[PDB]
Amino acid sequence: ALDTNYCFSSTEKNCCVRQLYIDFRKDLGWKWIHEPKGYHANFCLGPCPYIWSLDTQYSKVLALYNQHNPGASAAPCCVPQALEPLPIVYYVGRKPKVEQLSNMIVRSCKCS
Amino acid sequence: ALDTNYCFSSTEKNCCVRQLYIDFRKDLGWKWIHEPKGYHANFCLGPCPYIWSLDTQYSKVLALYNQHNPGASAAPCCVPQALEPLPIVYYVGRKPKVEQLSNMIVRSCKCS
Amino acid sequence: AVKFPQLCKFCDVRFSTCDNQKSCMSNCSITSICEKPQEVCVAVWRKNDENITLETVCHDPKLPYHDFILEDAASPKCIMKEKKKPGETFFMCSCSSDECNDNIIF
Amino acid sequence: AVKFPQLCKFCDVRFSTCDNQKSCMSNCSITSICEKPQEVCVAVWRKNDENITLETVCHDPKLPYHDFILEDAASPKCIMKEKKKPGETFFMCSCSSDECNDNIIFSE
Amino acid sequence: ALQCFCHLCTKDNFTCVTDGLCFVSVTETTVIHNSMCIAEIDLIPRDRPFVCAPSSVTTTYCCNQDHCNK
Amino acid sequence: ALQCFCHLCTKDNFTCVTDGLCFVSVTDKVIHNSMCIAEIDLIPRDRPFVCATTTYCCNQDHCNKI
Numbered sequence: 001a002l003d004t005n006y007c008f009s010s011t012e013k014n015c016c017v018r019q020l021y022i023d024f025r026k027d028l029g030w031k032w033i034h035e036p037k038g039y040h041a042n043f044c045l046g047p048c049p050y051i052w053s054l055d056t057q058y059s060k061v062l063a064l065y066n067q068h069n070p071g072a073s074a075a076p077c078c079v080p081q082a083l084e085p086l087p088i089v090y091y092v093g094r095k096p097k098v099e100q101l102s103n104m105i106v107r108s109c110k111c112s
Numbered sequence: 113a114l115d116t117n118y119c120f121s122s123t124e125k126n127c128c129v130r131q132l133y134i135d136f137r138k139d140l141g142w143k144w145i146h147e148p149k150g151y152h153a154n155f156c157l158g159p160c161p162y163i164w165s166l167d168t169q170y171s172k173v174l175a176l177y178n179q180h181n182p183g184a185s186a187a188p189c190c191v192p193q194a195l196e197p198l199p200i201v202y203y204v205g206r207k208p209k210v211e212q213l214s215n216m217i218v219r220s221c222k223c224s
Numbered sequence: 225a226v227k228f229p230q231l232c233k234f235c236d237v238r239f240s241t242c243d244n245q246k247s248c249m250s251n252c253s254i255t256s257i258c259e260k261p262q263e264v265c266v267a268v269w270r271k272n273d274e275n276i277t278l279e280t281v282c283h284d285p286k287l288p289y290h291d292f293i294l295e296d297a298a299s300p301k302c303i304m305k306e307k308k309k310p311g312e313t314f315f316m317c318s319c320s321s322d323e324c325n326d327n328i329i330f
Numbered sequence: 331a332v333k334f335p336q337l338c339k340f341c342d343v344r345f346s347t348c349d350n351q352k353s354c355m356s357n358c359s360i361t362s363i364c365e366k367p368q369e370v371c372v373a374v375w376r377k378n379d380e381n382i383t384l385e386t387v388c389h390d391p392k393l394p395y396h397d398f399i400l401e402d403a404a405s406p407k408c409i410m411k412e413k414k415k416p417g418e419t420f421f422m423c424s425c426s427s428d429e430c431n432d433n434i435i436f437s438e
Numbered sequence: 439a440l441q442c443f444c445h446l447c448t449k450d451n452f453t454c455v456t457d458g459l460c461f462v463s464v465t466e467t468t469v470i471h472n473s474m475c476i477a478e479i480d481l482i483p484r485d486r487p488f489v490c491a492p493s494s495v496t497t498t499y500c501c502n503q504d505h506c507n508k
Numbered sequence: 509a510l511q512c513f514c515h516l517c518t519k520d521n522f523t524c525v526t527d528g529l530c531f532v533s534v535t536d537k538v539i540h541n542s543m544c545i546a547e548i549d550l551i552p553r554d555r556p557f558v559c560a561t562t563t564y565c566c567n568q569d570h571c572n573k574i
Contacts, residue, residue: 005448012470020186028176030557031337031361031429043174043186050493051463052472053446056215057482058195061153064140064493074132074155077189079224083170091362092554093388094340101551103169112191113543117518141493143231143323144257144486163533163541163558165516169551172558203256204485205282206234213482226459226500228486257486332529332567334560363555 002053003082003108004042015046015053015078017109034096035089041105048076048111055081055112063111082107113165115194115220116154127158127165127190129221147201153217160188160223167193167222175223188223195219229258231322232265233280240269240278242328250280250326258282264297267325269304269315280325285318294318304330335364337428338371339386346384348375352437356386361429364388370403371431375410375421386431389424400424409435442475443507453505459490462507463498473507476500513572515542529565531558532572542572 242248
């Protein structure tokens with residue numbers, strides 16, 4: 001529900017997972033990661049109309065409100081929900097440590 | 113991290129719980145709730161600069177990304193972390209019914 | 225599809241003073257969700273001799289409330305129609321919209 | 331307070347092409363976190379007769395590398411302070427700044 | 439055992455099994471209508487869930503039969 | 509096991525207990541922020557990116573400068 005399987009396969013303006021490449025050195029500033037030089041992380045973007053994948057009840061109550069008060073600076077935000085790891089390789093001295101970076105990529109999003 | 117106690121006492125103009133009152137009959141359009149007639153739900157609002165109640169590693173990455181890239185449209189979002197129930201009284205027929213609406217109040221926020 | 229009940233005023237027989245007026249407010253705090261989907265809104269107004277009553281309930285149109293089959297049970301508004309009864313005035317109405325029996329229409 | 335290990339180039343001894351220049355660029359494709367938090371970066375430029383070799387590693391300043399005291403091991407930059415060694419030229423710098431041994435110096 | 443039609447359920451047959459009801463809403467654009475499953479635990483109140491009593495240019499309605507989501 | 513100085517911990521005597529370190533930064537006015545960091549968040553361990561406008565990650569109790 002609102003994962004890459006859907007968002008990448010279909011097309012729409014509402015909250016959904018979007019494409020977003022990231023170079024570690026240039027965008028994050030990190031210089032310690034040996035591999036990869038970057039990765040695909042994606043990100044959540046798009047309005048959250050009423051009843052469009054609203055996480056909890058407060059999510060709906062907030063949408064309803066907004067719907068009745070158009071432009072009220074108060075509504076659900078399109079944020080991540082399922083995050084995945086990222087296999088990396090960095091050097092500690094001479095022996096390269098190969099480990100996984102947790103919650104680095106996004107699988108799905110949700111309005112809340 | 114950002115909670116009711118912190119942000120109702122001060123003014124951080126950064127991601128945190130703002131104050132919001134919702135009138136069932138005029139804000140949401142519900143006429144089935146006998147009591148209360150409204151309640152303080154609040155909401156979350158404000159930017160998410162690097163290391164400012166960033167929830168997950170991905171949030172840390174998105175922030176660091178938006179830092180090296182201005183107006184990137186991709187940055188952590190101020191969204192609720194702790195939701196709380198709201199006891200309400202509504203009549204089903206002649207019978208006075210009482211229940212707790214789970215996740216209706218926001219007591220804290222976070223960047224995601 | 226699925227059928228859901230509607231909102232109606234449900235204060236039953238209560239005191240009232242709405243008199244010789246076009247419209248008045250049932251102004252009873254209790255607004256309820258009718259138990260039965262088929263049920264509609266109903267509002268009775270009575271003034272026997274030395275006082276005034278005012279009933280507000282839900283009621284399946286199939287049955288007759290006080291020997292009066294709900295005529296306008298599908299009506300949008302609560303059209304206060306009249307009914308003759310011995311030794312008492314008898315105004316009764318019905319409707320099919322939400323909280324319709326809150327505003328009587330003489 | 332905590333004292334964290336910094337990043338340094340760590341390709342050991344590789345064939346180089348750096349010569350007769352005001353400054354060269356190590357170009358080690360390996361940036362590592364020094365095991366020992368006290369360690370610093372090092373850069374050894376040993377030109378034998380025909381071949382030249384550059385060495386980039388992490389190293390504890392409290393020790394002598396190739397029989398030399400790391401006196402410049404507190405500098406943020408890597409300025410090659412030439413030494414004297416038989417049958418070849420020998421420059422050696424050491425600094426304390428993330429990837430400071432990636433840009434060796436003899437100029438300005 | 440209800441089984442409704444759901445569109446966000448890509449690699450899931452485009453269907454989902456709920457213990458509550460099926461939901462379908464059509465909105466006017468310039469036709470976007472999505473369908474989903476809503477568990478009974480999120481029907482509030484059960485007797486008359488506000489989720490199934492649509493708000494303002496939209497047309498939503500609930501149904502308790504398999505794939506009744508249009 | 510540890511015990512650090514927290515900033516947002518209003519109704520908690522401005523403190524917290526973790527097993528990692530105490531984070532602190534600095535800065536036209538001037539402000540700065542202190543907080544806790546679990547040892548699970550210390551990625552990568554040998555040199556957590558969060559710890560390396562200034563930044564300190566002391567390893568003691570209530571060791572947050574100003």
